[PDB]
């Protein structure tokens, strides 16, 4: 009994009429006759099963010894769970049935099909004497609504050929007679006939709903609910009290109304009272099905209903209602964190009290196999009395078994890790110290959870796929993993710190004999400037060790750690002070060279020697360790005197408020920087004890300086805050308060100074309190948008690549190229260090050798065989992701790349502090010749060359082939250096402010007539301004060449707003003159959820074509401003802009398809439809990376790029398609049909290309299936649309196989899923 | 909040792009609250209940 | 008795005492909370508060 | 003004009323939708006729019982825009009731 | 481990006897979900 | 979409009706101006709302006798646009006749 597809739709009523049973008529009370409710009452005896093992429903026949007997009183049989699909109660009731799929859901199935307005759908009940069914001599409409007197007049006037019913069953009397195959074709011909706003607004989508309903193959007469389905009490939650906030309230209400209806139909009551009973029955039935229907306000307790009949599928609208909620998993537990630093990375602990009952069936099976406990009761007597045999079995089982550990908030993929348990006295687990910071859980009372994998494959994947020895290089970050903090770095910093005046100086000695000398007596660990024996191995061949010996200058602790250092490693990583970054780069080098097992063993030995020598080192802070700077009070006094004199001149009347504010900022910054420099240069050279030189600068013996120089967690800000001043920090913005705070932790603080300190502390806690809802809600949408991803292809085969242009700014590179080389695999067009040749056979992995090969070549950017572009038309492939996990192998097919990619975005954004705290020239920092690329150079008569363009790019070949200097010059600047002039660095090449973007003119000659007026454009107290667009509101055209010449012989003359132009009329100036000088909550946000919502910018840019000549008429006209001179003139297409920024389109900025930024950032809708896919993708990735480098947390580019690819859903294809006219179509379903249009060779069958931006939230809440995209949705409105449309799921999505449960196509079982491909197709 | 007259800021936030408003509210000890709000059209409205 | 006992038994301002360290019975009778009926703009948190 | 900006201000005032009232039930959501369509109305006559001139609106309506019978044109237009805003805020607040419960 | 009575009983027998096998089918909780979806107006049949 | 365009259409139609008939009398200005105001309104449904949306027209009535008795809002809006166009044409007709008399010699 297998299953392939799941399709939910309204079935035929003939199966319900064949299953017509039950007697749910009268509400008799529950009696205590046969310890269960009796026949024809509350919980009637029709649909019951055996409440015990084998029984009848009365105390009767059908014992377990006899099968296949029809019951006497009832119609139930012997077997279970097969009769229950037939014995369900199907009784006809409430012929005015409920149509809540037209009420609760937003489309109307029965209303839009019969041309019925929504107001009539809301007013089906309280009706007035029927609707006239059509016939022979009927005059009015078949759906005409009349009153009671009008229907009585129609009844007394029509007479013959008239058959109608009383209630709302008459519509069913139409739907039993509905053999309609004509009206839907008329509606689709009316839809294809006209196209306007009266058909787009809620008529086109319901017309397409009728088109999808008529082509589904289902009959409309199957929509008739003739009977009321009654669920069996055995399948419902059994309750013999029996009614405590459950189904029984509406149950007894419906049965009571049914009894009243049947009694007044058997006793022949008049029409008004039975009409009232039928409308109360309908009010019971529709509230039994779906609550609310925009009325019947909830009163509260049991006098008002809470749980309806369809409320079992969703009782709560949160996260846990029937859609595979959080189940309490057995063989599991919850435990409290501590740390035991005496086991390896593969070994851990587990409490004795938990582990005695985590392996009960294993101990029972070993007692049955060893032949000591022959029965299960003897096994209980051996376990629950704690004899030594079950202790030995517990020791045998716990020694070799994988046990999962995780956190109850799990926002990383690193949370679930398997380890090996050890019987430890107590009842608290410990956590391994190379694991604690990866879970982001300090020792502050956090609680972990313990799980036990129970199968062969679960234990094998726990020992092979999910532990700490196979999760390296942090795929959420792409950075180094776990080097400890504050203990191991402290110990390895103390034992490797050089210092003079050692006990027994200058000894020549071998390697291990220094540990022989150090352990007894007469040797310090500092031990500076002593040459001893050291043995270093190197590798040059294919994993070959070179035996070498050397005499090297080092210390005791470094040479002891050199034995802890494995065979082949360099020596220059040892001679430093060995801080946190030094141990991190040492771990990086040993992981890069020696593999995985030697670097795991070496990190284990680093952990061992750190937590073994931290006790020998000794950390101590006290009353004398905090060094008070001797020049502190003088700096405080002179700063107070300067602030006092400056506020005296402030109240004299020479300084304004903002000037005093900025002076307070930089003067108090200079003050606490002088205090910091004073405590630094009083902290360095305190120790002067030495030998043979009697005066030497030596590192001091204070602890705070050692923890500051170690660089583990101690920064310079905390160092200047502890011994120096605390500083000046405000609550709302983190501003600098003008009140003096010159306190110190060595002295007594003032009351108001500590009050400003708790201002700052409470503001910081109010800023960090946002991290809960910011991290709990964003990752939900990020994973739900990346659900339907099955990687199933290794041969990608694409041609379009992505130009990897970095965000390089300045002399030193900020974001390098080496992180972009590794991972992804480049395309077939890359070049050698030689000129104009090829480097790859189009299948080549990229790491440090090939990274050096792609570093030594002369190229600025390469193209990458990569994502989204052409997609192989079979899944997502493998060369777009490459290698980002712990293994260096290519990520093959069947791996959930998108689920890793979604959790690797805002991993620790968390809004760390104050929402990440949210020149006047162009100074260069790198040498090289300047060549103007894409720059309209205009020769100026002053002797210089101004820049009349906005784009500036340059490639530099000085040391590396990749460029290191772009320096995008703003529009309207004066370049001090000519084209092709050598610069030496540190010199201003553009003498213009970057905040001002004027428009430099292109042609000389006579000034356009823009004559002044008093108060309109001029300001009188040359410097005579002639035009001001911002003051009047442009009335300006193209200037002449010399006197009156046209500009046709070799694009509009502009002036900025609110400026005083020094050029007057009748001056005859040359070409190239520069005009006048006059031209935080957004950046604090993570800016991730707003891009998924497809946010709208403030002002969109102006798009045009290749013909991009612009012009303007008067100030204002009858239409909107700036009637466009381009586009319209060669291709009819207009645009309307009410208000935007100033126009900057000129001859220097070339305008083509995909125009540059003119008036603010353009929305990515038109940028995706017109510019390109890869441009919008790289722009989104660069914006998110700019936000993340403003925050200070590095993320992965491939994950953000996959997220942008998931934002590319819901496109509208070209109208030259098969049943396609401006329809929102799935992009994957559109690109499946490429081969169908290629084989037929017709443009009418399929569209060419399409891509639209439409929201990632809408793409995540409306997917190909109805099981997925239903957690953060309403289940009823999705199931009604899936039942009307008749859409199946085919069981392919990841969330579908999570909710349903099969062989999931992500991971190791996808090949087993391909076994299903070997089962259905050709099997 | 004490029974009296409050003059909060209400810096636009739903209609304007940074225009300031000068409004007033009256919260009594019981009943409905009175609101004398501002307007870029410079009109005085009442939005009780 | 249907209003006084209901208010003194089930209310947001009348909860279970953390009856532990002697300081707690002082700081539970001498605390100020803005949450509850009346005088609460937003139930979860607030920036201006 | 356009239809989109007026509708954005409409459900903005609706979600501000939800954040002020802390409404969970759908039957209590509907009264907030009616009060929010009662709120956020424009007093400029040009904006009122611009809502009637923009897209996403039709001349014929479903219900005629809410249509008043008076010589005032602006009252009939305000009732029609009020009915359209109640329908549209219900259709786009059925999801917002789940979104607000899933935010906090 | 968390859903089925028969499934936990079969896993208990496989852990005592030392077998460690999977399940031969449906956990019948998705059948409870389909039963709760049959509480609406739609009547669900199974497709194989 | 604005009132200025329909005002320019009515302006051009009134100039054409002055130029074609050559009327020099101020009392016989009835039929040409009334037919120009009747032929200036748009026949589409959305254009009536577009004229009512822009500025230059209000809700306050000058004469209550021009109000029809119907249940259609679109006919009342068409009558209001017709009333505003008659106000504009009967206020600009004297200036256009002055320009027509000063144009030729």
Short mmCIF file of C-alpha atoms in Angstrom, two decimals, chain F:
data_model
loop_
_atom_site.label_atom_id
_atom_site.label_comp_id
_atom_site.label_asym_id
_atom_site.label_seq_id
_atom_site.Cartn_x
_atom_site.Cartn_y
_atom_site.Cartn_z
CA UNK F 1 -6.74 63.67 -16.54
CA UNK F 2 -6.77 67.34 -15.53
CA UNK F 3 -9.32 70.13 -15.87
CA UNK F 4 -6.89 72.32 -17.85
CA UNK F 5 -6.98 70.00 -20.89
CA UNK F 6 -10.79 69.97 -21.09
CA UNK F 7 -10.73 73.74 -20.48
CA UNK F 8 -8.39 74.09 -23.48
CA UNK F 9 -10.73 71.90 -25.56
CA UNK F 10 -13.72 74.08 -24.63
CA UNK F 11 -11.58 77.17 -25.31
CA UNK F 12 -10.70 75.92 -28.80
CA UNK F 13 -14.32 74.94 -29.52
CA UNK F 14 -15.57 78.37 -28.41
CA UNK F 15 -12.96 80.09 -30.59
CA UNK F 16 -14.05 77.93 -33.54
CA UNK F 17 -17.73 78.73 -32.89
CA UNK F 18 -16.92 82.45 -32.77
CA UNK F 19 -14.82 82.25 -35.96
CA UNK F 20 -17.33 80.20 -37.96
CA UNK F 21 -20.52 82.15 -37.20
CA UNK F 22 -18.98 85.68 -36.86
CA UNK F 23 -21.26 86.83 -34.05
CA UNK F 24 -20.90 90.49 -33.05
CA UNK F 25 -23.94 90.67 -30.72
CA UNK F 26 -23.88 89.90 -27.00
CA UNK F 27 -27.56 88.92 -26.67
CA UNK F 28 -27.55 86.25 -29.42
CA UNK F 29 -24.75 84.21 -27.79
CA UNK F 30 -27.08 81.41 -26.67
CA UNK F 31 -26.97 78.45 -29.06
CA UNK F 32 -23.26 78.48 -29.95
CA UNK F 33 -22.05 78.71 -26.34
CA UNK F 34 -24.57 76.13 -25.06
CA UNK F 35 -23.67 73.66 -27.82
CA UNK F 36 -19.96 74.29 -27.17
CA UNK F 37 -20.51 73.52 -23.48
CA UNK F 38 -22.56 70.44 -24.37
CA UNK F 39 -19.90 69.17 -26.80
CA UNK F 40 -16.97 69.77 -24.43
CA UNK F 41 -17.79 67.04 -21.89
CA UNK F 42 -16.15 63.62 -22.38
CA UNK F 43 -18.19 60.55 -23.29
CA UNK F 44 -16.07 58.09 -21.29
CA UNK F 45 -16.84 57.15 -17.70
CA UNK F 46 -13.36 57.41 -16.17
CA UNK F 47 -12.70 60.80 -17.79
CA UNK F 48 -15.57 62.33 -15.78
CA UNK F 49 -13.92 61.18 -12.54
CA UNK F 50 -10.57 62.41 -13.91
CA UNK F 51 -12.01 65.90 -14.49
CA UNK F 52 -13.63 65.85 -11.03
CA UNK F 53 -10.34 64.71 -9.44
CA UNK F 54 -8.28 67.73 -10.53
CA UNK F 55 -8.61 71.26 -9.16
CA UNK F 56 -10.78 74.04 -10.56
CA UNK F 57 -14.15 72.58 -9.50
CA UNK F 58 -15.86 72.37 -6.10
CA UNK F 59 -18.94 70.94 -4.37
CA UNK F 60 -20.80 74.19 -3.62
CA UNK F 61 -23.69 74.80 -6.03
CA UNK F 62 -24.50 78.09 -7.75
CA UNK F 63 -28.00 77.21 -8.98
CA UNK F 64 -30.14 74.38 -7.59
CA UNK F 65 -32.43 74.31 -10.64
CA UNK F 66 -29.86 72.49 -12.79
CA UNK F 67 -29.92 69.36 -10.59
CA UNK F 68 -31.52 66.34 -12.30
CA UNK F 69 -33.66 63.76 -10.51
CA UNK F 70 -31.91 60.40 -10.91
CA UNK F 71 -30.19 57.70 -8.87
CA UNK F 72 -26.97 57.86 -10.92
CA UNK F 73 -23.96 59.64 -9.44
CA UNK F 74 -22.23 59.84 -12.84
CA UNK F 75 -25.03 61.98 -14.30
CA UNK F 76 -24.78 64.39 -11.35
CA UNK F 77 -21.00 64.61 -11.87
CA UNK F 78 -21.52 65.22 -15.60
CA UNK F 79 -24.02 67.98 -14.76
CA UNK F 80 -21.52 69.52 -12.32
CA UNK F 81 -18.76 69.49 -14.97
CA UNK F 82 -21.27 70.99 -17.44
CA UNK F 83 -22.13 73.71 -14.91
CA UNK F 84 -18.46 74.57 -14.32
CA UNK F 85 -17.83 74.65 -18.08
CA UNK F 86 -20.82 76.98 -18.59
CA UNK F 87 -19.45 79.25 -15.83
CA UNK F 88 -16.02 79.35 -17.50
CA UNK F 89 -17.38 79.87 -21.03
CA UNK F 90 -19.91 82.55 -20.05
CA UNK F 91 -17.18 84.37 -18.11
CA UNK F 92 -14.60 84.12 -20.92
CA UNK F 93 -16.92 84.75 -23.90
CA UNK F 94 -16.78 88.55 -23.53
CA UNK F 95 -12.97 88.53 -23.49
CA UNK F 96 -12.88 86.19 -26.48
CA UNK F 97 -15.28 88.44 -28.41
CA UNK F 98 -13.05 91.40 -27.53
CA UNK F 99 -10.02 89.49 -28.83
CA UNK F 100 -11.97 88.52 -31.98
CA UNK F 101 -12.92 92.15 -32.63
CA UNK F 102 -9.34 93.32 -31.97
CA UNK F 103 -7.82 90.52 -34.08
CA UNK F 104 -9.14 91.62 -37.49
CA UNK F 105 -9.18 95.14 -38.90
#
